[PDB]
Design a protein around this nucleic acid. Sequence first.
RNA 1: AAAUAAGAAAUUA
Lengths: 52, 41, 49, 58, 141, 163, 30, 52, 155, 160, 110, 175, 154, 142, 241, 51, 58
Amino acid sequence: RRGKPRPRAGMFPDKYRRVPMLLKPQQGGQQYFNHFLIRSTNDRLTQQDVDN
Amino acid sequence: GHVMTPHTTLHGRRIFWIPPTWNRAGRFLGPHVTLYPGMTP
Amino acid sequence: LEPCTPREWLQFSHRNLAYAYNGALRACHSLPSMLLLYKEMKQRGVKVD
Amino acid sequence: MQQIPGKVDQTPFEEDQTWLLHSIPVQQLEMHHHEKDLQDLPFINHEQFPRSLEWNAP
Amino acid sequence: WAKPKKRPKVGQGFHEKAQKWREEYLLDRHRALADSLRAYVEFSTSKRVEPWDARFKPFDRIEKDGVYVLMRYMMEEKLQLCNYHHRPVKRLFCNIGLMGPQITTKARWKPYRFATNPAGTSKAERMYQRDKTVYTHGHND
Amino acid sequence: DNLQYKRYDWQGWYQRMLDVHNRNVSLRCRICDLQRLDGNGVQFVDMQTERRLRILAQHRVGMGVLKLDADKYEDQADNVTFGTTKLSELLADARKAQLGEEYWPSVELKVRKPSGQSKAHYSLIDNERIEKRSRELYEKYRDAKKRSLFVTPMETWLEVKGM
Amino acid sequence: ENQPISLHRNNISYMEDVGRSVKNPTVPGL
Amino acid sequence: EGLPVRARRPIFSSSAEQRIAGGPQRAVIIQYHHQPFFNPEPRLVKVAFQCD
Amino acid sequence: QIGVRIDEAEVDPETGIAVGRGCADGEKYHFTALLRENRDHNGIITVMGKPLSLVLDNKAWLMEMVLMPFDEANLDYRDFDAHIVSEGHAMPSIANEIAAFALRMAVANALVKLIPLTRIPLKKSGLLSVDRRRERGQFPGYLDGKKVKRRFAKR
Amino acid sequence: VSTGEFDHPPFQFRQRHTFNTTPLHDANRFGGRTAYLREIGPVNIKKQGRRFKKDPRTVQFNVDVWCAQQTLRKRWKQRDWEVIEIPFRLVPREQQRVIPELYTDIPQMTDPARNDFSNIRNKVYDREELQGVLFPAAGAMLYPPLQRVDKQAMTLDKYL
Amino acid sequence: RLTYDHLDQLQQWTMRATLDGRTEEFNRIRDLHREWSQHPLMPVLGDVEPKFPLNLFKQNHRAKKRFLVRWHKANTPANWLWMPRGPTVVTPLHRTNPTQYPENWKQMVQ
Amino acid sequence: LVRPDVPEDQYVDSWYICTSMTHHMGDYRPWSASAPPNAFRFRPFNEFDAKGREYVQYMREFARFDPRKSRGNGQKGFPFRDAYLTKMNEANQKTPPPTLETIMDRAVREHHQHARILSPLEVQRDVGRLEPIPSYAGKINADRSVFPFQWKTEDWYEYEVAKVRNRRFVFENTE
Amino acid sequence: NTFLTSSVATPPISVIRTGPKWWADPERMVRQKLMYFTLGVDQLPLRRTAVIQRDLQRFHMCKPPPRVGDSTGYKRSRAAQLNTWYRRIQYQEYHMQHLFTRHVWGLLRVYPGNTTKIQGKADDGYVGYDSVPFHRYNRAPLPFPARELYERRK
Amino acid sequence: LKIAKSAFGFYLARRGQRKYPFLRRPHIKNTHSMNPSAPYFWSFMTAKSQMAFLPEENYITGDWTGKFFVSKRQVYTLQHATSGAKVRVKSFPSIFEFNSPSRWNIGKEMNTLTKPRMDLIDEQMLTKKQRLDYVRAGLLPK
Amino acid sequence: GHRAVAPASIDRQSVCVKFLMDELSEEKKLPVVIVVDGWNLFSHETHFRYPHPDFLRGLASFNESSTDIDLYPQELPRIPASRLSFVRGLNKMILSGDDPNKFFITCTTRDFKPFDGISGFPNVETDRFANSLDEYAPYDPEKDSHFHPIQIGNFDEYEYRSFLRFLINSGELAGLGWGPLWHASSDFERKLYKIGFLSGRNPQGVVDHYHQELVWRYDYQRTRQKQYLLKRRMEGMSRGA
Amino acid sequence: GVHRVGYTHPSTLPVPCAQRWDLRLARARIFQEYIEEKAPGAWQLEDERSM
Amino acid sequence: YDPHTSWPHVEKLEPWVRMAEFWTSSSDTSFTELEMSTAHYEFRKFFRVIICKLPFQS
RNA sequence: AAAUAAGAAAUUA
Ligand SMILES: Nc1nc2c(ncn2[C@@H]2O[C@H](COP(=O)(O)OP(=O)(O)OP(=O)(O)O)[C@@H](O)[C@H]2O)c(=O)[nH]1
């Protein structure tokens, strides 16, 4: 501040300290999870038919 | 923060021994205080 | 544990108690020891799975 | 608004220009209110008795 | 907080000097006032540049059409009576009604100090070439 | 005051000051209870009388309750006198609606301007006269346009007084 | 835990197949 | 529910603003909500009159 | 390990309405969503009596925030009617991202009271989570009234 | 639910014309009204200024008057109607009641029993239906009667 | 400042131009766009914009900005070598000349 | 915790000391003593949270609302804002039919393909349980006149102002 | 154009550094896109910008990935290279916006803010009604009234 | 205060350059009261209405022995010019007299005829330091 | 009518419009279709006001004529559109019977500036409504016109889908859309559903939100898809190994 | 518009009725009310902020 | 608190709270240092209301 | 002058 050098960025408390951990980053897209699960499962069976 | 925690030395949740008094502490509100409250059900 | 404080109530549910009891059930190796636990969880209303 | 009959009068203007180019002045000195003047400024807000601001006259 | 030093005494014969200086400052102010009244009225009475900004519409349009037609045939006399002072000009345009809501909204007018230039003004420098000895608040030529 | 201003030389002026701060006396009555047979068998306040009562006392009615707040005098006694008087004076005037229709307050309708459909006829007003005339005006125009490049309406049908 | 979207700042938003620019394309100046 | 009660039997006229009460008759309580938000002022009792 | 709390449904038995609340800035924005199921499949969201489009000023990046909870829960927004109520500081325009954050939260809490299990996706995507942030209190020491200390000169 | 600006910006370091920033009393704010508030130029503090033009409370008051004018103006442009004072007899069945003055009672429904619920306050009547009442002297109707649409008629929208 | 007002005036200009069959200004615009919109090339390692040297002036000093400005002033977009403009440039994403745009369609017919 | 975890009504922010104290010296009543016996999440009533209680109440008040009863009461005489203003709105009165694509889709699934489309409340979303379908599930119907609340701005203004001006018009003493 | 007065130019990088606040504010970016689309020209650079910035915004509250120390400094240099790429992708855009806006203003008979070039019309900066009576950068005297770039009919 | 020009020099603190609410500064020092305007001549620092009566101070209210100076809100009247009587006003250092009567004064308050801050400066009421500071600002020659 | 140097064009056009409409009304055998967009503007007043009568009387000085035209602005009654010579022509054809030669297929415009009970001042940078009309007065096609009213709604989903599909895909085919960046925006179905929610299926809203789609923050689809495609590729590479 | 405010005396109407202005004078006598003659008709402005 | 459960009952009434803002510094020299020391303290007054409605007057 | 409902990210003792 006054006639003295600014503190390095790490010397201030965390900028987002008041935002909950579930918000940074948001994990959105949950809707799709199940979908891709089924998909992948399905694909596995496909990949057996090739082999067997 | 870390640039002020000489001056924040009272400000967390602090067990006290002698609680501070208004002669000795200008702006401190007390340990139980929540300035930035979240909404809880 | 029965909730005591509002904080403790936010951790609590019958439907989750299901989970804990299921664990405690998979633990018992004999049917007789299981039957007791089950009687409990039936009696204290616990959503069953 | 009721007006005195027989008095030549104007109606609130519809056109923006009519407002803007008329001779209506701007507030210049300090501003007054016939009740609120007794509580001096907004920062000196004089209070005779500490009644709840929501107190209701019976 | 230091104890305030005492102020030195006033002066000798400074009461006479202050009397005289204020006296003839006032006498001067009479002519400065007279002259600036002359200037103010001379300005009110004399013509000005056109108040509207021709770079926008409805003013850009060729002088033989649109608003200029409306001016040459219906408003001319009045526009000349008020000497193109920007206030009465804008009001007359409101009262001619054949433009109607546009005067304030679509149309652009020159800024205050430019609109105040004497008719005939060629270079912008003119704003700064008016007399500074006179107290009209920029209402003097 | 029971606390501080209870007992000494200031108890008097503080007391009086509270009393004057409290002069207001609120006087209420429901308009319901005003509609009753009068001693003469006529209803004391009927529909028209009520409409007149409402218009006379404007913001002084709400939820069908007439309310007068009498603040005028320093003492509550005098304010019930005052308030009571204003009440009977206002009833006396509202009751005029029982003297005949001339005193029944008017209804305020918002009446629309004429509609689009009506306004359409504005362009046919005096149709015959206007066509017959516009032929003569066309002659006036044809002639005027041999002399000058631009013919103004002010050379044709518009009058503008020169001097 | 499971399959997080990137938990970190400054990731690669945009990729394309492009050529390399010349060495020091910027003029040093003023 | 089940409590015997004597309730003043409501009489219905269009001519009446508010309501009309009639002499107390024997009736049973069918449901009575305690909770203020299920039973706003003035409080009500659902009741089955014994007569009809 | 208890995963996420699954509750029962708190719904008005008659009106079939559920009630959530959003916040942002601790004061400025408090909203309350009334959420109910539309069987006709024409659902609509409405804020303080006005359609959501108008209230958020047609800005998409605001309105999609209010769409998100229906997505995360794998629901069709058209099966639901919503009305949001402003309980905080009123302003002529609430279109801005902070207000929208609060909105999204209100809607999500309502949705959870209505369809209990839907709570687990929502909680994981951090919709129900409340951030506590505020403009600094006003204070006459600072020039702007908030963050800026006055000029300093060496003696 | 207006998007317009109702608050004068707070005084700070001088704003300049920039991307993302304009001067405080710039001609583009408040529809060019800011003219009234402007001290042009590099103002010499000690000797010159007009105090009210930098004062937050005063300035904001002025702006508020201007906003009020805007709203008033638009509410009056919004009227297509006059209030006429018509004697109780001749008025339509819906107004034959008592109509509490403004802000006195609950906002009032015109005719709940006939399925019309709307503010009686804001109900507007057609000059053509009140013709017999408003111009009795005239004999022959001055306005020709409204023509109305048969909603039972087979027309282009009924697919016939 | 580009305004919705300007966007509407733009629409009307564009329309009036389409209806008078004026294809020329569309072509100047297409050209401009083709020239300056090409994809900029990934920079070589070691290539970065210069920062302002520390321990020169105090952190609150003007010199800082004065440097930045004077740098960007010297690199004009005509000096940007990391964006490939020229006649030499192959432009896979865009049409080359007037003859390839839809209002020429009659010559495209067999 | 700085101080025992107890309903905060038991604490007072001390004068002259930065600390709280207990307005009954040192006695403490646990949370359980604030609520009714075995109250879910100690609550005045278990059915709803505070806001849920508020708007349930409003809706119930409004169902039994009659304008003739409002006379002589202050703001208590006012009907629930949103619901009333929604009714007062005429454009709300016409509620759209269930759009052609929708009615077709549902029709095809329940006649052609032998599986009805379940309303989102009738869907069973617990992988591990089967729960009784709530009694309101497909039943409550859709009138824009009822909900969601949608209203004219003029009426809203008038309503709000009236409700403020009338706080004191109350006949207390009534038969 | 309503904003006519002389202005202060900011270096491109500081304009871009405003991120969501201005340079990438959704509202602004959309009407840029509108201008391009209406002229019948793809907005690729805008879309690149929007992509980069969209993602910037999404992760803006996270901490950067943990750095292991290297004598090579390959990591640091690769992060840098990526960063200046993005900077340049956005310079190109910023240029496009100023470019097309000036051109479109030339077509709409719009007068720019003071001291601004419009390629076909005003080569040296256009000025009229400045606070200062000369053209600022030419040091030449300004005519009264304000100079006109376009022929009169409208 | 630093220098005491009156008694109050002892009692008052300056508090640096401190801001007061709009149009309330504790001490009414009207530097602007003579500030020439031709067009605003009759509206500036005068009565807001021309139908107002002259102030208290143009009249002899009670039994007087006599006065030393008349107040400065007194308004200059044709008789001030014509009667040829002493018209004094309290200004600094001592008193300003209207000696040379003119009709151009008429109808304005003497506030407006008396320049509060003179372009004239006494070098003898100034400390050597203060004189230095007046030379820096380019007021005093040296 | 229109080919002349100004000012002559001005008087010529008057004469010419009068006679044109007089010619149209006199043709009884040849079908004539009159399409007017925004009829509701023709059925009430224009925004012009009659000139203040003192413009008509000539003047010596402003000093004393007993004239205010220079002092204060004032509103004089608006000129009704039916007094426009053109609109006169048309109304003449509508109202007179014995003209079954003519067909008015006509339209309404609701393009008015928004007004909700308070108005601030519009920010001039961000204003979508700057070219909208000031009207704020209600219009009912039944009472306000002699035409048979037909009502039009927003798109139903069948219309809406066809329209959006067009805007996106034929936009992309013309090189006006995401192009090589296509993997940044979500798939058609998701866009369709979301733009539905945002627009309410109002056509202008659909156009508008289609453009705005460039800025959507909270769409996660391509992210999770990309993630899954990646995982699947790496399992494939572990099975090959 | 600039108009003359006007008043129709009930004796002249084809139904007598009590004119609102007349009522206004009644109300002014009852609660003694200053009637500002110069109050401009154009100046009705509610205070937006508080109302 | 509920009137069904008791006579007389009790209503809450919003508290009177006045916040005092003032300089904690005594400094003749700088305005800045005065502003930077500003305290907030409140006066408070709390209220309960007791309601008794009676069927007659005694 | 600032990392505090905003949006900044890599050279410790
Ligand atoms: N191709 C096609 N486009 C349409 C159709 N309807 C609407 N649109 C598009 O959506 C926009 C809707 O705007 P308008 O049709 O001008 O809206 P409007 O009904 O005239 O509404 P107002 O003028 O504002 O009263 C149009 O500009 C078209 O681009 C349609 O039927 N076919």
